[PDB]
Design a binder for these strands. Sequence first.
DNA 1: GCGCGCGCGC
DNA 2: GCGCGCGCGC
Lengths: 98, 99
Amino acid sequence: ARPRPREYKAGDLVFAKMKGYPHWPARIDELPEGAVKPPANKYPIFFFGTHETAFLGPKDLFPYKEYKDKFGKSNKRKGFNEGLWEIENNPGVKFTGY
Amino acid sequence: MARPRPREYKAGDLVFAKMKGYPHWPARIDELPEGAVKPPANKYPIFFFGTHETAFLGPKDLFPYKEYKDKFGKSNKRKGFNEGLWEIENNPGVKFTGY
DNA sequence: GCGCGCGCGC
DNA sequence: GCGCGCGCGC
């Protein structure tokens, strides 16, 4: 079983998992120099569709393409179908990384 | 040393019956009246409280009710379980044709 | 397997 | 605003 990665980098597209929500189309944001240091090994997440943000570790992240069809099915939670759209057609919304 | 569960049961006896996939479950030995197709060897007709389902099971899957009450008697959220706990105390002869 | 809850319908 | 379907988590 090919492992899910243990480290990600700014700009990667993923599905992210939070309790109560289905695996959600998302992106690894940049971690700027200059800020308060995040929790260890937790990554800055940008959810597509909602543009909400959080920090998550690799345990809850899934590479977009690889895990696409297990997770990319339409669903009625507000903003989900909008996220499916953005991750394909405008994946860089508010992307500061580069 | 450990007390044997009964290897024989009598019509009317109250038990927890175990079935594959279900928790140990509040139940009763029904009568097997003559005039019917004979049961399989050493199996008893079982009445499940709450669901009122029925089946045949052998001594190995039956546990005397009072004795095993505290090990199996706590609430469970399978459909009709708690309704069974209730019945086995308050209306245990429901649909009992045995006597 | 089963109850909660979100999100849409009527 | 209340019902119901379906997907969440336990």
